[PDB]
């Protein structure tokens, strides 16, 4: 009687939609759908799942970006101010959280029982992948090259595999299209690694003190020299360092060095792909394309 | 092939759970537990069924502290350091997530469908409550109370209810205990409040920390709403004052505004709509339950 | 005995003058002197008292633009470092104050009964205004653009008007020249607002939190939106922000909206010259260049 | 029309006022009063007057509070937060320069000419003092002896003696009295000075904030100018240190010197000149004044 | 000419010798001219000579102290504030420097060539210390040991054996008494790491500074090392705390570890170890030597 | 037997030495050498001695870099990343003391009773210089021209007079190039002070609170001027300010006094060469063009 339990209004969505809002008003390359129609091509999930399944991967990717920032000590997305820049890092973290949780109600349309196991399972291996990825971050320990790409194997590999594994169990195709999207995972992440210090923030993970696969060749291939992981642990917003450091990596050929284990990888993709093609599958021109655009 | 997809290892989860464990080396007051005990008196959940429900709000509970210690920018849980001061806010908070996802990994093994419509409405819930005390933190705009109210109704009431509904869920009679429930999640806060700036809490959870972190808490707004054109305690908010002679003169001015007595007496009439529901309960079929009122009496000062 | 009362040497006045003294080294577009003179064609006031007139409310615009810098955590002053960014805080507001009480002393020399009753209301009305803006910038509340121009006709009206009415009171003519000082006042402060965002810091009252008549335009025209409040919350010295910020006050029309406003006053103003100059004063063509350069 | 001019309102006064209303409702020492009654045993100003002249200088005093506390960036006043703790140094600077203003504006009831020339030249060298101070704080050099008591003159003697000007001009008794009560004001920041390190001060106004400040006290040239070639203590000023255990050093130290001794015989030979000329005006048509020599003593240790 | 170059005077000397005086003015242990006459009971060094080694060693150690405090960031030296919190790091670290320079320049008067190979290779050895134990820090990466006890060898046995290397060096007597003297340094700073954590130091160098600065100290290389798979500790090194509260769970669990045990133990096995030595020495034409063991006893808890 | 001694490995010098080894890597105008070669040229030491006088000026060149660096704030060193902004002011500041060891252990080869003591007498008259600088620094007492000569002669004096003294301690010649070397270092430490401010951090002495010889005449010669000192007492990292303080240098005409200046020593440097040249010495065209070098 002295509470009268009110109800949830669209103020107040609109309040707790806006670091999320925000981020989807930003143009970027969106490649993730491209990578879900692409596989259609061979899975043809009907348009009402496929539908579903898009917009779920949609905001689990744009809540991971929020939270991801936040994460990363990030200062720009797309170009323009990161959501926390805005909202706070409560608010948006918060916002993040809220829209996984309202992605899983969304899930819960496709009505189908594998696929709560499914989400699950991925955001098992999400955190278990950025897990051990911070954990180096924070203790000054690189890892392998073994050990960097299992991580990613889990950190890139989950909302990727997320988006096929829904589309497998939402298809009547039962062909293990995994496999393929942990390799292309993989190296859209090398990719992403490597663009971070050759392209056109300038060198944002190096401020992050990421060990990134550039980074982590250049820390192993001299140990004897520390100043690379030192600038790592200097976190450095000034750009002298960040210059430096793409001159020492350079010196160490490891861009070089992530250019051909891009391309061997590139190849395993390409034989992994054509084997599905020659086991009776229409020939991908889409994933053909999209692969491509993982190159400079 | 070159990449070769190797296992998670136990060292691994370690790390993963090193924040969450070390938060959970740490005495709390069971106050989660006790209620389910109190509710299963009258539901009767099996013994497996409800270690189920009892580790899944567990862990909800103790990655809820993990995350909302970062986002309240808090300096001590249960009187020992906050786990981002010792692992760092971003792996206290990826040891949060992570453990969400393994309760919705657990809560699965009830093998019940409509308890995880039950997980998800309440996890909604949970940061829609979150998300509108963040809302009126970052505006420094004080809330109404009916408005404190409903957001205490999202917030804390998102996890009791979840414990008794997933119990419900698990149960096969035919009795709604949710808004029961619902009452007692915002007595536990409103006391909760008081208690944060009223308890020799300040050696647990620091010196009137909810002005700290500027918390529009039930006495805070009764306090500044109830001289609006005195404008000290919500500018104090404003300062988030680490500071230890500023927190004191809030809490001197708060006296001033008979904001205490008003807490104390609300807590009162919401014990009584607490006992007049019990006995409304009890009084259709169901036992008289006496764990259900040494908690509720176990709520008070 | 034990005391021997010393008495002001030239170089303490010259430690006290110094904050002012260098903000009068930097060359700034004065408009004040120049509506003193336009509005002097009407009024006649001797040359003497004129000097007086001009002299205080110089003191006055330096003295407050070293308090109001150190205020609005200002950086820059006419393109030069500003005061306290030299002095300090301490030394450069104790230099604004001692030059607000040197300029008392001037007032005196106009000997005139009415001359402190004016400077102290415009004083009255000066921190009344400016008091309002802050109450709205500390408290994250938007006001309305009626309370924004209310605070305006205090906060820049003092000045305005004080040069004005101790004018007045020094002249012959009894025409309550005031009433326009108003009008050109509030338009001048629309006009210092919109080129604050739209002109050659970039955007500094973004990073001063101001709830500038854009500002609130943009705001309270979607409130739905919260970025741009958020924003002004964060106090930005970061540019991509700022930056930001104007794209969302152009999304939403508001230079537009403030344009079309300051048309609209400047109509007012016309008129309001009008009518006095069609009641048997000359022409005056200075206050219309005057206002003329009030745009952009 | 467009914009329709309104008028102001009392809320908007209470915002205006609102840090100094604050540190208003904060207990103070009374001393501008008391020696205005002191005072007006002699000068007999009307109570109207009076009333007037009184209010205005509670006001100029409790104005230069706020704006001093910020320019020192002094942490408690009256033991209380300072009022920019609360509202920010922004609304706490506008609202005494707003209060400066309302003094002026209340001196004109007065209606008497000869007392806008006092109001002004004293505001006048109430801020040539704390600009000297400022200056010699900012760089780190030491006044001398003479050089900081004319600075005291201006910035301390300039309330004593505008509050005793202003009575002298509404009074009508030849007799000038301002010798006396600026030297009443020198003795009052020597006080002052030495009270700041030596009496639990330490409490009111933090553990010898007139270090963690930097200003260039009376016991701390002393100490300083005493020992040139040892740099310890103006070094000290210089780190100008919020922590406990450097004013502890610095204290030590400055016993070590023989300070506070120096300190509390000056005090001595000023309270024998004060003593010697309150006498010397009794002996010239005035009554013996008790309450005049009552706060001279209670100027003490 | 133009410029006509001047002396050196003695109030620049005051000014280059201000961080080094004061942390001469401050109470020390005493334990290094202890040391040097427990020894020269055995080598007998002439009074003059001796005068000069324990200059040197004086001199070397201050030094040592006035610029270790910079490098790891410390608040109190001797209870009272570091130098640098007075002067500036930037003045304390010339002034060390430069005291280093006036050693090098005093070590010559012993007109000893061997000598200065011995000074030499003692500084050389005292950086190669401090450069390991720094390398540990700043790369969060526990040690070993035996990689913590050869540190210390360099660190803290590069003085005790300057000392007394230059002794045998003056002497004539064909005994190496360095490996003794090593072991009690090693014994020395296990000892010092102990007690940092262990005794109300917390009121000398702060509670438990090694904590606040992140060294890799002995107990703290056992805790570490003791459970690998438990992180707390080390990252809390990471988070380098001020607070006291970070400080007293680091210490509550390196009791969980029998940490303090170990280290006592250890400390048992090398006092035996020591007395072993001075018993194996004094019985080959060597006095019983008192002093030599009862500063090893005062090594003790 | 509970300890075994531990040998000095490789791997722990190259960690000992990398702040300093780090600075040898990066390419720098090196003169130092350049005024032992132009030296020698009159010495003729041998050239075992001549190769251990010149790798112990070097490295205590470098060494000093660290500790300076640590004690300016210097951000920059030969245009790249300062060595504690890699390796922090500990471990850096540990390497210069380090190798200042090496150093003397490297002198010992000279296997010369008085090269100890020059060694000496140099760094005590090293630390006697920068002494004072700080002292002046951290007290805000602006010195006089004698007063900072006097430092210099100190200071800089302190490596070039030990280059040359060590030379002239190793050579058969007994001829005092010393009176001469003392003047050389002081006007390339002038001709350092002011390319600083006026060449291509930008003014980055201004930052570091420094009083350098057009500082201190820009200072002193009207001294009613606290601006100036002002700037150097807020060591500022703004580059408005900066050129403020330029422009206040420029208006003073200090550059034209310190060119003057460096002009006459230049004068005073001939005579002084060609002294030594007409008592009997091959004329000396290396250090007639290094002199030239000074100059901007």
Same mark, same amino acid.
């Given at each position: 009687?002295? =509470?009268?339990?009110?109800?949830?209004?669209?103020?107040?969505?609109?309040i707790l939609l806006?670091?999320?809002?925000?981020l989807e008003?930003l143009?970027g390359?969106?490649?993730?759908?491209?990578?879900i129609?692409? !596989?259609?091509?061979?899975?043809k999930?009907?348009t009402?799942s496929?539908?579903?399944?898009?917009?779920?991967?949609?905001?689990?990717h744009?809540?991971?970006?929020?939270?991801?920032?936040?994460?990363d000590?990030?200062?720009?997305?797309?170009?323009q101010?990161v959501?926390?820049?805005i909202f706070?890092?409560?608010?948006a973290?918060?916002?993040?959280? =809220?829209? =996984?949780?309202?992605?899983?109600?969304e899930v819960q349309?496709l009505?189908?029982?594998?696929?709560?196991?499914?989400?699950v399972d991925?955001?098992?291996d999400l955190?278990?992948g950025?897990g051990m990825?911070?954990?180096?971050?924070?203790s000054?320990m690189?890892?392998t090259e073994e050990?960097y790409?299992?991580?990613?194997?889990n950190?890139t590999?989950?909302? !990727?595999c997320?988006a096929?594994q829904?589309?497998?169990a939402?298809?009547?195709?039962?062909?293990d !299209?995994?496999?393929?999207?942990?390799?292309?995972?993989?190296?859209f992440q090398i990719?992403?690694?490597?663009?971070?210090?050759?392209?056109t923030?300038?060198?944002?993970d190096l401020?992050?003190?990421?060990?990134?696969?550039p980074?982590?060749?250049?820390?192993?291939?001299?140990?004897g020299?520390?100043?690379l992981?030192?600038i790592?642990?200097?976190?450095?917003?000034?750009?002298?360092?960040?210059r430096?450091?793409?001159?020492?990596?350079?010196?160490?050929?490891?861009?070089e =060095?992530?250019r051909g284990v891009?391309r061997?990888?590139?190849?395993?993709?390409?034989?992994?792909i054509?084997?599905?093609?020659?086991?009776?599958?229409?020939?991908?021109?889409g994933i053909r394309k999209?692969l491509?655009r993982?190159?400079?």
């Open positions: 009687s002295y =509470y009268q339990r009110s109800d949830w209004t669209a103020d107040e969505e609109q806006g670091p999320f809002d925000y008003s143009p390359k969106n490649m993730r759908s491209q990578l129609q692409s !596989f259609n091509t061979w899975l999930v009907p009402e496929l539908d579903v399944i898009i917009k779920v991967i949609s905001m689990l744009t809540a991971s970006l929020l939270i991801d920032d936040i994460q000590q990030s200062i720009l997305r797309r170009g101010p959501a926390h820049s706070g890092t409560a608010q973290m918060n916002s993040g959280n =809220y829209v =996984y949780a309202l992605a899983l109600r349309k009505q189908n029982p594998k696929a709560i196991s499914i989400y991925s955001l098992i955190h278990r950025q990825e911070l954990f180096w971050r924070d000054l690189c890892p050990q790409l299992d991580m990613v194997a950190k590999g989950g909302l !990727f997320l096929i829904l589309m497998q939402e298809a009547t195709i039962q062909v !299209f995994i496999p393929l999207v942990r390799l292309l995972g993989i190296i990719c992403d690694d490597y663009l971070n210090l050759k392209s923030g300038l060198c944002e401020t992050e003190g990421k060990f990134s696969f980074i982590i060749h250049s820390i192993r291939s001299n140990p020299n520390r100043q992981i030192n790592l642990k200097q976190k450095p917003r000034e750009d002298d360092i960040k430096y450091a793409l001159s020492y990596m350079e010196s160490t050929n490891s861009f =060095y992530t891009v061997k990888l590139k190849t395993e993709a390409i034989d992994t054509q084997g599905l093609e020659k086991h009776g599958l229409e020939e991908n021109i999209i491509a993982m190159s400079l």
